[PDB]
Design a protein around this ligand. Structure first.
Ligand code: BGC
Length: 372
């Protein structure tokens, strides 16, 4: 097992760069050339492509063809970053991100078939030429640690573990590295959550190993779709008593608990919306947090990373894609999307939220260098 980020160039997602044209246009219409040019810089920053429904499976081969073309032109070894995000009864403790599969409508079997489709796409001759970094199921197993009081979560616990296990077991290839989602310091970093978190990650890996002998993963992904700083420049009161008060400290805090259960303690850390601290009044505010800024750009530089346990800082959640609708009539309306810290109005989860990414650019830290 080696750090897949070393010696590779993570792929820029063209479809995301294209959505940013709307942001560029907004800045140009305001006569704001600096921020338009900064948005152009963002178009060239690698992000993760989310396979958040069955239809999106159809983007994988075009992405692979694009990556193979770029690899052969540039001579760089490309790293394609994907998220698998379609568990049945998905995101059980909120409403914002409910998906297409439901346990009461053959969802477990449908999830398996969805995974099988992805595996086939990742098994082509072109796929063989590439390497993949894959985050598995954000906002899943953390719910088994803290949210079992929520009926949907209690009902989905087995399906989450078995689903992720099937995914792990199905993606054992020399050119794929897997990272299981591990929430963020404000959720699973509290002292009493550390051991059961480590245990459920190991339980899930062991289930995978019952399907595919010797199945492994690279490690964990943390802070996916959240806002926590890597290293805080002002510790917030809501983090007191939690040793995982920034994501660098979450890594330090969780690592020995992973080691205790024989789970690999290697991490990738989302910093795509982490540039601006101090934008929340409570740690559990997650939905479209107003004035979020783009954070530390994707990097493996140990001068910044400062941890042998961290493979890379990455951008997993693509800034500008909504966390959830603020429309109170919507089936997927979640009250968290109208928290005192939320940017309202906001469109459905995953849909483009131009005003939000306008603010991500303005609030970026370090500031974005313009590409004029
Ligand atoms: O933006 C990345 C993903 O974020 C999730 O919160 C949404 O539910 C998905 O629709 C989206 O693809």
């Amino acid at each position: 097992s080696v750090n897949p980020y070393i010696g590779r160039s993570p792929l820029v997602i063209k479809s995301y760069a294209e959505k940013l044209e709307e942001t560029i246009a907004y800045f140009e219409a305001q006569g704001d050339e600096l921020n338009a040019a900064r948005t152009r810089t963002v178009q060239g920053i690698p992000t993760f492509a989310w396979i958040s429904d069955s239809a999106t499976i159809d983007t994988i081969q075009p992405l692979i063809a694009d990556a193979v073309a770029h690899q052969e032109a540039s001579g760089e070894q490309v790293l394609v970053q994907l998220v698998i995000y379609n568990l049945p009864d998905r995101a059980c403790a909120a409403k914002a991100s409910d998906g297409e599969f439901h346990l009461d409508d053959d969802g477990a079997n449908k999830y398996r078939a969805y995974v099988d489709r992805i595996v086939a796409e990742l098994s082509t001759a072109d796929a063989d030429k590439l390497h993949f970094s894959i985050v598995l199921e954000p906002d899943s197993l953390g719910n088994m640690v803290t949210n079992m009081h929520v009926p949907k979560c209690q009902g989905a616990a087995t399906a989450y573990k078995e689903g992720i296990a099937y995914t792990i077991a199905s993606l054992q290839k020399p050119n794929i590295d897997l990272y299981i989602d591990a929430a963020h310091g404000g959720w699973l970093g509290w002292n009493d959550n550390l051991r059961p978190s480590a245990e459920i990650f190991k339980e899930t890996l062991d289930l995978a190993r019952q399907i595919t002998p010797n199945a492994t993963v690279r490690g964990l992904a943390i802070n996916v779709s959240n806002y926590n700083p890597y290293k805080t420049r002002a510790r917030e009161d809501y983090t007191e008593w939690n040793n995982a008060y920034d994501e660098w400290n979450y890594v330090k805090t969780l690592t020995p608990h992973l080691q205790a259960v024989g789970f690999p303690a290697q991490f990738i850390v989302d910093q795509g919306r982490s540039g601006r601290e101090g934008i929340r009044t409570e740690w559990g505010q997650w939905c479209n947090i107003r004035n979020a800024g783009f954070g530390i750009r994707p990097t493996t530089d140990q001068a910044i990373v400062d941890s042998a346990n961290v493979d890379a800082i990455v951008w997993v959640k693509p800034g500008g894609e909504s966390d959830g609708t603020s429309d109170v009539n919507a089936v997927r309306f979640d009250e968290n999307c109208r928290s005192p810290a939320s940017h309202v109005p906001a469109p459905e989860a995953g849909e483009w939220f131009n005003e939000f990414v306008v603010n991500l650019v303005i609030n970026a830290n370090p500031p974005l260098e313009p590409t004029y």
